Amino acid sequence: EAPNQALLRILKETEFKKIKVLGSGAFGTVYKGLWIPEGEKVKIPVAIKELREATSPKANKEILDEAYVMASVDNPHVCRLLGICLTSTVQLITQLMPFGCLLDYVREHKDNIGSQYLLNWCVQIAKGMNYLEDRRLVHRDLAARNVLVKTPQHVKITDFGRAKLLGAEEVPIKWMALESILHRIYTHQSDVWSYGVTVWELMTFGSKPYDGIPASEISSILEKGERLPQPPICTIDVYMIMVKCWMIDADSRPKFRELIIEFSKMARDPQRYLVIQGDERMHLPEEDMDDVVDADEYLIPQ
Numbered sequence: 040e041a042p043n044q045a046l047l048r049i050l051k052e053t054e055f056k057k058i059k060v061l062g063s064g065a066f067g068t069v070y071k072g073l074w075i076p077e078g079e080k081v082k083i084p085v086a087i088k089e090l091r092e093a094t095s096p097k098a099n100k101e102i103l104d105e106a107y108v109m110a111s112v113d114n115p116h117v118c119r120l121l122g123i124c125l126t127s128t129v130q131l132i133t134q135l136m137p138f139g140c141l142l143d144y145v146r147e148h149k150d151n152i153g154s155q156y157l158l159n160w161c162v163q164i165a166k167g168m169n170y171l172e173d174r175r176l177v178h179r180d181l182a183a184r185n186v187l188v189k190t191p192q193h194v195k196i197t198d199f200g201r202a203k204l205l206g207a208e209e210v211p212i213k214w215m216a217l218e219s220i221l222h223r224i225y226t227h228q229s230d231v232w233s234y235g236v237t238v239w240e241l242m243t244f245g246s247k248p249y250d251g252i253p254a255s256e257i258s259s260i261l262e263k264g265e266r267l268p269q270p271p272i273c274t275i276d277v278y279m280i281m282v283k284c285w286m287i288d289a290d291s292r293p294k295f296r297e298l299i300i301e302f303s304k305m306a307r308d309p310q311r312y313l314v315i316q317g318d319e320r321m322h323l324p325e326e327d328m329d330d331v332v333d334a335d336e337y338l339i340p341q
């Protein structure tokens with residue numbers, strides 16, 4: 040086990056301003072923001088994640104764990120933490136994704152969403168997931184909701200709160216593998232299953248898995264050998280890949296690097312693998328912004 044030498048960056052509240060609430064839920068809320076690095080003359084669009092006035096340590100322990108992980112990852116399809124604020128309750132500052140989470144995005148723009156885009160997102164998500172495997176990280180919460188859109192072409196994974204190192208002792212049932220549901224066993228292969236469902240959400244355009252079904256039931260349903268239905272737009276090949284992710288034997292399940300390859304192939308001839316109406320037709324997209332720089336463009340030594 041190599042040492043983790045990731046730098047953790049501490050940011051003064053003066054450095055950035057919250058502009059809007061992108062989302063609020065539970066303990067904490069997320070704000071669109073602008074961050075200006077000290078003496079740098081760059082403005083970086085950011086999302087700031089903060090919990091409540093309530094500052095309970097247990098909450099803080101959880102947030103910081105999440106920050107730790109985000110600080111430690113560097114991939115194009117993985118979200119990275121820029122810095123943290125220690126003002127009163129802690130805040131996580133990370134690059135902003137203008138178009139939001141993917142799950143919302145498919146639902147909003149389904150009429151204008153191409154097959155090519157869908158296959159690419161699969162490729163990119165598998166790329167992100169493979170990188171986590173490389174770092175021996177298990178996301179343990181893969182879902183469409185946890186995927187964010189920098190641009191229609193570019194997407195990255197997020198929400199590393201449940202993330203853990205492989206083989207470490209240390210709840211979305213529908214996403215969870217069966218082995219995990221019965222025994223709380225998590226592995227990269229468990230992650231792959233969750234990926235399968237994530238793929239299904241996109242194909243199904245944001246439809247909720249196992250809709251109308253109580254979670255307690257789900258374990259039995261999976262036990263029976265029941266699985267999610269093949270989506271209308273899905274070719275047999277694409278669905279078949281999905282089903283492989285839902286195999287009882289985790290080893291039987293496809294590796295993330297294999298998933299990248301297979302979906303890659305399909306993206307070369309997207310129309311053959313997904314059938315969508317008017318696929319060809321579809322196309323997809325404060326005063327001073329001169330200094331604006333994207334987080335990807337903004338780099339620091341090390």
Ligand SMILES: CN1CCN(c2ccc(Nc3ncc4nc(Nc5ccccc5)n(C5CCCC5)c4n3)cc2)CC1
Nearest residue numbers: 061062069086088131133134135136137138139140198
């Ligand atoms: C219909 N509306 C469309 C616009 N919209 C939206 C939401 C988020 C973004 N961007 C963005 N960026 C970074 C984020 N980081 C977290 N979360 C997060 C997790 C860990 C560390 C830092 C942030 N989020 C969450 C995703 C949904 C609510 C905000 C983030 N969201 C852009 C537009 C809300 C829905």
Ligand SMILES: [Cl-]
Nearest residue numbers: 210211212213
């Ligand atoms: Cl759930």
